[PDB]
Amino acid sequence: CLESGTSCIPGAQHNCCSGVCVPIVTIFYGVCY
């Protein structure tokens, strides 16, 4: 899983450990919470 601070794509497969993807740039690019 993508750990806290690892980048994810909101709306896409955000395999974050918390599952939470925080949109940083926009809802198109973010980081795992």
Give DSSP secondary structure letters for 7-22.
EE-TTS---BSSS-EE
Give the C-alpha separation, 3 to 6, whole Å: 5
Which residue is associated with the tokens 């993807």?
21
Q: How far is CA 12 from CA 7, 21, in A?
A: 12, 10
Residue spans of the domains in the chain: they are: 1-33
**By what technique were these coordinates determined?**
NMR
CA distance 33 to 18: 6
Quote the Cα angle for 7-10-15, to 5°.
Answer: 60
DSSP state at residue 6: -
